[PDB]
Design a protein around this ligand. Structure first.
Ligand SMILES: *[C@@H]1O[C@H](CO)[C@@H](O[C@@H]2O[C@H](CO)[C@@H](O)[C@H](O)[C@H]2NC(C)=O)[C@H](O)[C@H]1NC(C)=O
Ligand SMILES: *[C@@H]1O[C@H](CO)[C@@H](O[C@@H]2O[C@H](CO)[C@@H](O)[C@H](O)[C@H]2NC(C)=O)[C@H](O)[C@H]1NC(C)=O
Lengths: 84, 505, 48, 48, 48, 47
């Protein structure tokens, strides 16, 4: 068959990246349960942004939500290591 | 949360909805969630009083905390598993207030005199429902009576807030958050509300509620939550690097056994290796820990039969490293259990009168034993599952040693392969991966009763399938790996580590 | 490989943006040819 | 921009008030939960 | 060979860019009046 | 809801509004560089 065209493959790569973080979203939202209220407030706000971005397929919102969800994930990772 | 103290006395009330708003498949997921939880609780060694109640129009009590059977984890698991969704389907109401009133009756003492230890006792309530209580009065008013009866939140001098924790699980396809959020307890930075998607990835669920305040130092206990890193999955795993001029850089594995000691192989080091040239990293920190001395086994000798014609002799390939400073145990730093100890007795859930031989029988039967060792892939720790060939194929596992380079024409097999060696590898019964030379020194791990016990130490392998530093591409099937049995060197470890207070039998 | 190096920042790019490639060689022989090779795949599907 | 609201206190004590707001087409939101004292009618007297 | 460098210094937004070299009768390339020499590329944030 | 706005339930409220905080004590025992100890304290801000 013919190979995929210019942007179809690129848009799929971005979506796969967002789907990956969404799979562990319920885990991270749960992980903040024992953390401070800053995280619980931050992640549920960042969570919907990614959820809406995926079903809307908006490149602008999918890109930002990816890095927005990635940052709060890193904040949780450092929080759990320093909490022990 | 929930405190895990071996001296504890804790009541756990399990209330399970059985209305038509749940569904059979979700009711089963509710059961599977409880079974894993009860099993994980028993892994800590704490004996609570379990109460089991299923309710719809009328609550049905299955296990009461007054019975001595309430402290039997396996029996309660049997009672819960037998319960069927359509057992009381014809009474398919949702009367949570009466179910809580039954729990109120359980903690309630006769007359006006509470039995001693009432404030000493912890109380935990776990409720699973759709948030749509349709029968009976308000369920919240019974919570206030429980708060009153237990004298919790009723006094500024003594709050008693930590003696009661309430978790609510949102089950069923359709669910109401509002009433569930009202039922659940509300405490700062403590999760008490769970949704439908939370029913998957159970290890993360329990990680939020469990507090290991009095259970930090237990051996062979792993956190399996998805967010966990390599050292959450292997708390005892230690990475040992030896860099010395001429010799160069070299890396082996080690296993935490006490606050000052890590267990690893002896052939990784030598008497010429200085303590400053050995670096060990446990939790994964880039700060390398300083060591004090390396305790080689007295009967270790790599050149024991060198004059006879044998290049290398790996008998008693074990060593104990004493750290300069003692470790502080945590979620990523915990020892692995050692055979014939009181800790292993409690890990195997054995009575305190269990003998070292009885523990030997359980760990090493004359059969293929499931086990695993640790390996590195792109600077990331990963698990490799193998089989210990201890059954009838134990002789065939030892015979494959003839193909090892450097020992092809050695006449006597019993000379080179000592009874200290445990034999793994091969394709029967299943394909067992073969170690890299960097994987040497690691522990040989066996899983029993939701805990992990060390039974050996990675020694050497017949064929170095990981020669080109990569274990890529297929290899001949007769490549076997050998490991040092812990029962053979048990007197030396008991002699050296009796001052660490590990409770040897 | 020896006498060969590729920066990590360049290495971990992968298919997403690797169009220009930078390979560093510590030395090249003057007597005969030194060689290397690698595969390429089309992923954009454009002619000419 | 200020958005006024009208309310009536119903019970004495340091009671709780919560408000939330969210913008369209951007996922930026904010919420404010504060408490203020509900005082019954009267006034202080320091008689001897 | 000429090298055109495109910079994106947004802190949380990668950009899908339509980039084009236009025709010039004094230079030869795929860019002609009939056929445009256009590509669609993606620049990660704080990268080139 | 399917509209382009954050739902109300997931909006988490700011509620920590004390005027004064960070009532802490710490000792400079870090390695002295030119006699000056360099201490790093990671602190949570308030709302
Ligand atoms: C359990 O209940 C008592 C309530 O009387 C708790 O309070 C203690 O009471 C004893 C005797 O009345 C005092 O000596 C203690 O000082 C009390 N503890 C305080 C004030 O913290 C107590 O927690 C328990 N009683 C025991 C363990 O005897
Ligand atoms: C409870 O209900 C079912 C029971 O397993 C699961 O939910 C999904 O239900 C739909 C239709 O009812 C099925 O097509 C899916 O296969 C079910 N499973 C999924 C989506 O993983 C689930 O366990 C529970 N939750 C809900 C919302 O139904």
């Amino acid at each position: 068959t013919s190979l995929p065209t210019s942007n179809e493959y690129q848009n799929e790569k971005l979506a796969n990246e967002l789907k990956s973080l969404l799979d562990e979203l319920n885990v991270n939202e749960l992980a903040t349960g024992s953390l401070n209220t800053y995280y619980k407030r931050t992640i549920k706000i960042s969570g919907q942004k990614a959820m809406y971005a995926l079903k809307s397929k908006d490149f602008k919102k999918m890109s930002e939500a990816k890095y927005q969800l990635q940052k709060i994930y890193n904040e949780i990772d450092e929080a759990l290591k320093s909490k022990y | 949360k929930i405190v895990l103290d071996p001296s504890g006395s804790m009541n756990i009330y399990l209330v399970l909805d059985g209305s038509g708003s749940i569904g059979a498949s979700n009711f089963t997921g509710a059961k599977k969630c409880l079974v894993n939880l009860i099993e994980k609780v028993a892994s800590y060694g704490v004996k609570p009083r379990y109460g089991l109640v299923t309710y719809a129009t009328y609550p049905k009590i299955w296990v009461k905390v007054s019975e001595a059977d309430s402290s039997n984890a396996d029996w309660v698991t049997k009672q819960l598993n037998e319960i069927n969704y359509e057992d009381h389907k014809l009474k398919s109401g949702t009367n949570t207030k009466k179910a809580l009133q039954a729990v109120y009756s359980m903690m309630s003492w006769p007359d006006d005199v509470p039995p001693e230890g009432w404030n000493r006792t912890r109380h935990v309530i776990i409720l699973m429902t759709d948030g749509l209580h349709n029968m009976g009065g308000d369920p919240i008013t019974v919570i206030d009576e429980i708060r009153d009866l237990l004298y919790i939140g009723k006094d500024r001098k003594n709050p008693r807030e930590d003696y009661l924790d309430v978790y609510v699980f949102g089950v069923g396809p359709l669910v109401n958050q509002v009433n569930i959020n009202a039922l659940a307890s509300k405490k700062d930075n403590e999760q008490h509300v769970f949704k439908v998607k939370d029913m998957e990835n159970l290890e993360d669920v329990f990680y939020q509620m469990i507090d290991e305040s009095q259970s930090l130092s237990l051996c062979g206990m792993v956190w399996e939550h998805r967010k966990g890193t390599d050292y959450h999955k292997q708390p005892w795993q230690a990475k040992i690097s030896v860099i010395r001029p001429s010799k160069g850089h070299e890396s082996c594995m080690g296993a935490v056994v006490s606050e000052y000691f890590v267990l690893t192989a002896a052939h990784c080091f030598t008497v010429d290796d200085k303590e400053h040239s050995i670096k060990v990293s446990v939790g994964g920190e880039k700060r390398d820990l300083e060591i004090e001395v390396v305790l080689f086994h007295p009967n270790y000798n790599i050149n024991g039969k060198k004059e006879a014609g044998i290049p290398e002799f790996y008998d008693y390939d074990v060593a104990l490293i004493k750290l300069k400073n003692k470790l502080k145990y945590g979620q990523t730093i915990r020892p692995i259990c050692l055979p014939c100890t009181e800790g292993t007795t409690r890990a195997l859930r054995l009575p305190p009168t269990t003998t070292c031989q009885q523990q030997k029988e359980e760990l090493l039967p004359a059969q293929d034993i499931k086990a695993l060792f640790v390996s590195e892939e792109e600077k990331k720790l990963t698990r490799k599952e193998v089989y210990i060939k201890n059954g009838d194929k134990k002789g065939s596992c030892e015979r494959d040693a003839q193909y090892a380079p450097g020992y092809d024409k050695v006449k006597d097999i019993s000379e080179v392969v000592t009874p200290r060696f445990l034999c793994t590898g091969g394709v029967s019964p299943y394909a067992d991966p073969n170690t890299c030379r960097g994987d040497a020194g690691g522990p040989l791990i066996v899983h029993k009763r939701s805990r992990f016990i060390q039974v050996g130490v990675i020694s050497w392998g017949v064929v170095d399938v990981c020669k080109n530093q990569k274990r890529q591409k297929q290899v001949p099937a007769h490549a076997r790996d050998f490991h040092i049995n812990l029962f053979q060197v048990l007197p030396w470890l008991k002699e050296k580590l009796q001052d660490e207070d590990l409770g040897f039998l | 490989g020896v006498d060969r190096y590729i920066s990590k920042y360049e290495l971990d790019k992968a298919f997403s943006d690797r169009n220009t490639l930078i390979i560093y060689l510590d030395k090249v022989s003057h007597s005969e040819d030194d060689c290397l090779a690698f595969k390429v795949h089309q992923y954009f599907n454009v002619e000419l | 921009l200020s958005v006024p609201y009208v309310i009536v206190p119903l019970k004495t004590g340091l009671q709780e008030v919560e408000v939330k707001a969210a913008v369209y087409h951007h996922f930026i939101s904010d919420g404010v939960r504060k408490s203020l004292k509900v005082v019954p009618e009267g006034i202080r007297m320091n008689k001897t | 060979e000429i090298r055109a460098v495109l910079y994106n210094y947004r802190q949380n937004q990668e950009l899908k860019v339509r980039v084009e070299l236009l025709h010039n009768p004094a230079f030869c390339s795929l860019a002609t009046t009939k056929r445009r020499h256009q590509q669609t590329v993606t620049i990660p944030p704080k990268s080139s | 809801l399917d509209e382009d706005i954050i739902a109300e339930e997931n909006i988490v409220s700011r509620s920590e509004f004390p005027e004064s905080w960070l009532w802490n004590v710490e000792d400079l025992k870090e390695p002295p560089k030119n006699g000056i100890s360099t201490k790093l304290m990671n602190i949570f801000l308030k709302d």
